[PDB]
Design a protein around this ligand. Structure first.
Ligand SMILES: *[C@@H]1O[C@H](CO)[C@@H](O[C@@H]2O[C@H](CO)[C@@H](O)[C@H](O)[C@H]2NC(C)=O)[C@H](O)[C@H]1NC(C)=O
Ligand SMILES: *[C@@H]1O[C@H](CO)[C@@H](O[C@@H]2O[C@H](CO)[C@@H](O)[C@H](O)[C@H]2NC(C)=O)[C@H](O)[C@H]1NC(C)=O
Ligand SMILES: *[C@@H]1O[C@H](CO)[C@@H](O[C@@H]2O[C@H](CO)[C@@H](O)[C@H](O)[C@H]2NC(C)=O)[C@H](O)[C@H]1NC(C)=O
Ligand SMILES: *[C@@H]1O[C@H](CO)[C@@H](O)[C@H](O)[C@H]1NC(C)=O
Ligand SMILES: *[C@@H]1O[C@H](CO)[C@@H](O)[C@H](O)[C@H]1NC(C)=O
Ligand SMILES: *[C@@H]1O[C@H](CO)[C@@H](O)[C@H](O)[C@H]1NC(C)=O
Ligand SMILES: *[C@@H]1O[C@H](CO)[C@@H](O)[C@H](O)[C@H]1NC(C)=O
Ligand SMILES: *[C@@H]1O[C@H](CO)[C@@H](O)[C@H](O)[C@H]1NC(C)=O
Ligand SMILES: *[C@@H]1O[C@H](CO)[C@@H](O)[C@H](O)[C@H]1NC(C)=O
Ligand SMILES: *[C@@H]1O[C@H](CO)[C@@H](O)[C@H](O)[C@H]1NC(C)=O
Ligand SMILES: *[C@@H]1O[C@H](CO)[C@@H](O)[C@H](O)[C@H]1NC(C)=O
Ligand SMILES: *[C@@H]1O[C@H](CO)[C@@H](O)[C@H](O)[C@H]1NC(C)=O
Lengths: 278, 278, 278
């Protein structure tokens, strides 16, 4: 009457293997949910021959700018303060309404930044704020990726608001030269898009005002816009769980368990033979 | 007498397949050891409606602070130097012993930072150090994540040492306004923990001292504490090698090799038939 | 005459499964090409007992340096400006030709940085530039990983050019103390190499010149070189697609499809039996 016992015994292999099968599909499902929740990042650096001329959206307001001078040389030659002119920018002043507020027009000024990173070209601006009641001399600016696109785009009055919302506006101080070493990051969201963001590393250098040494003491600002490295750090969140390399593995495990059940039927046959031997 | 030769020939399939099997399990084992050694990082940005009020653990020492003023406006209105008062902080001065030393009590001061990032709220502090022998005016500070937790926690005298050991204490200078744009990173170690770290980007703005223009020339410090972006960069090291999606693949490869050995037995049968045909 | 119809019907399982097989190998091939294009990054922090003494390649030019003083104390004690001496560096002045130009010899100066991060040792330099026509007082520097290697290496005149090309040269300003908190990143390119890069976070602190308060007003520079954290952020791009864990999965899927074709032959047998029943 204990033959059905041996039957359920040989079937215990089926039972345990179906149990580990449902356990494994559960674990694989929950791990796929996890790896689908938050993907994995991946950085790659693509060295570029020469950058596309960025757009420096300075917001001087009242402070008139003195000079512009690109300098392929690693060092900007000796300047002469308080003297306007010497401008050699492809500058363009453009107005728009702050998308944050729409309550105050923020006059701007656009500059074609440096292009030749290997030649180490660098825009060197100069500004002046003849004494006012600001109490903190600061001219904030902004960087978008390619200046020619701004020149050619239609209704750039709105393209500028799009930039101001996309990028971030960090100010350069007043009273010392701020060597801004720009650098790009072409980050790619997974929804088939490419987002260009500027990450810069300022380095302020104090201005020795002993050269003018006068009674005017008018505030004057200095900037240097440079390309940090000839590379473009582009980061894209890689989806580490595709719907294919997981179902194939689940099928492989299901087949492993099926083959194991077949080997278990073979082992039950061997055990029946051994019992017949006894 | 050369039949055993054909036998060992048909068995050479078994031999080579068992060899590639041990090679593949070796490679999979060593790759699992590697991917278990150092996991893969993964960044995700979770935009928050409004931040939990951080805790600014300034260490003024002797320098009394003049004013506090939150400013939902993007710009702090014009200040008046040398004049105390106007404080509207939920400030709290707290003492403790430096866990690094335990040899000197470091008087502190806690401030409830800004909360509404979308409203662009910003704490604007002011300090004074009437002329002393410091030779370098610097007031270091510290940031922990949520101020109300500090208020409610028990024995915050030790919670502060825990913070000082966990976070990092970077000083803001003296003589110009330092626009500190705080930002959080809720990093998650894999051992079921969540670590909150502050990564800020200062931006100093020189102070035009021509407004006081007196013979006192007392050192005075300005700060601005702001939330950089409404996002919270949270990074978690994803374990790229789970103990399951590797053993399933090993079993799939073992079955591929078993099926290949079966097809090889079939090919040996075909070769025996071809030999019988000849 | 419609028996061949049932034949092609049972064969439609073979057809659809071979179709999904070629589709799956196509998808796996293209995903392997993708994951081979750009690998996945992975950060790990290895706390070190004590750092290997870095090499600070300052480029003073004409500015003679006043003093050196390591300070295990977290704060450098009160200095005395304008007074040379007090040097306790293992300094070494070395010349070479700028690999960028080869048109101008750039005199340098090497300093053995701090070693004991847990002891919070910190090099504190001092410089002077008696009034000149620079108009912007800046002394740029440079960091390589281990100073003893520089001392022992052969023909360091070229090792220095190698460093200048490998690392990046960021200047510390003139007129205020720049607390440079160095930190290493031992990044590993996949081609069996280990690249050591310095990523530092400066923090300038204004110099109160009321202590000299003379008519000389000579430019003088202050630096502090410190180790930020006792950790060494080492990042290595993990190849997320190995040539092995993909072919094993492809074989597992091929076997899943073979077993499915066998079950389909069984289903065709069941359908033939059902048709015979009718
Ligand atoms: C862009 O906006 C600026 C600032 O509003 C304009 O500058 C003003 O132009 C008017 C023209 O009559 C002057 O009267 C004002 O004195 C200017 N500045 C202010 C407000 O004091 C500028 O005209 C606008 N764009 C351009 C270049 O036309
Ligand atoms: C926290 O520590 C500070 C600094 O030690 C304390 O400030 C001192 O308080 C005593 C009270 O009699 C004064 O006599 C000292 O002049 C204060 N500062 C020093 C050392 O000169 C403060 O009292 C402590 N906490 C509070 C708010 O009670
Ligand atoms: C490394 O280069 C510097 C700068 O060229 C050398 O300093 C010059 O040394 C000569 C020796 O006669 C002096 O006449 C010059 O006045 C020095 N500086 C300059 C150019 O004005 C230095 O000698 C070189 N290395 C060493 C330490 O010998
Ligand atoms: C600006 O630079 C170009 C470079 O070729 C030069 O030709 C031009 O004369 C410069 N303009 C001025 C205003 O000097
Ligand atoms: C622009 O400002 C107006 C108020 O003048 C406001 O009603 C509108 O919503 C703003 N535009 C947006 C969508 O930000
Ligand atoms: C200072 O700037 C203003 C314009 O903002 C101008 O009217 C005034 O003449 C300037 N002074 C000098 C010295 O150029
Ligand atoms: C602080 O700000 C709140 C905002 O409602 C205001 O009601 C309160 O009067 C302010 N306190 C002072 C000291 O002005
Ligand atoms: C605190 O300082 C004391 C010396 O007063 C020292 O013995 C103790 O180890 C310190 N606590 C720790 C664990 O840092
Ligand atoms: C300067 O600060 C000290 C307190 O540190 C105070 O005794 C002194 O009166 C202050 N001077 C002024 C001008 O308020
Ligand atoms: C430099 O520091 C060491 C530390 O032991 C000291 O022995 C030596 O006297 C110092 N040198 C000078 C110039 O003081
Ligand atoms: C070094 O400069 C010379 C010019 O004097 C130049 O010909 C050579 O290419 C430079 N070396 C390199 C490879 O940078
Ligand atoms: C200033 O430095 C120069 C050397 O560069 C030296 O000749 C001159 O005597 C120095 N002056 C003082 C006050 O030491």
């Amino acid at each position: 009457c204990l033959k059905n016992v041996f039957s359920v015994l040989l079937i215990f292999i089926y039972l345990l293997l179906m149990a580990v099968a449902v356990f494994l599909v559960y674990r694989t499902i929950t791990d796929f949910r996890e790896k689908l929740k938050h993907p994995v990042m991946s950085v790659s650096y693509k060295e570029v021959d020469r950058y596309d001329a960025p757009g420096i959206a300075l917001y001087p307001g009242q402070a008139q700018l003195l000079s512009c001078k690109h300098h392929y040389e690693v060092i900007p030659p000796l300047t002469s303060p308080g003297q306007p002119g010497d401008m050699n920018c492809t500058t363009q002043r453009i107005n728009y309404t702050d998308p944050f507020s729409n309550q105050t027009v923020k006059s701007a000024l656009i500059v074609q930044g440096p292009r030749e990173v290997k030649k180490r070209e660098l825009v060197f601006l100069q500004f002046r704020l003849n004494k006012s009641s600001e109490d903190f001399s600061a001219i904030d600016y902004l960087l978008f990726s390619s200046f020619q696109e701004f020149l050619q785009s239609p209704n750039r009055v709105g393209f500028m608001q799009a930039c101001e919302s996309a990028y971030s506006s960090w100010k350069f101080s007043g009273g010392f030269r701020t060597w801004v070493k720009m650098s790009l990051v072409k980050t790619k969201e997974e929804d088939g898009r490419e987002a260009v963001e500027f990450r810069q590393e300022t380095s302020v250098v104090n201005y020795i005002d002993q050269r003018p040494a006068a009674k005017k003491s008018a505030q004057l600002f200095f900037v240097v816009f440079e390309w940090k490295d000839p590379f473009i750090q582009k980061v894209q969140d890689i989806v580490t769980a595709n719907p294919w390399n997981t179902i194939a593995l689940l099928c492989g495990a299901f087949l492993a368990l099926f083959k194991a059940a077949e080997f278990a039927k073979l082992s039950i046959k061997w055990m029946i033979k051994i019992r017949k031997r006894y």
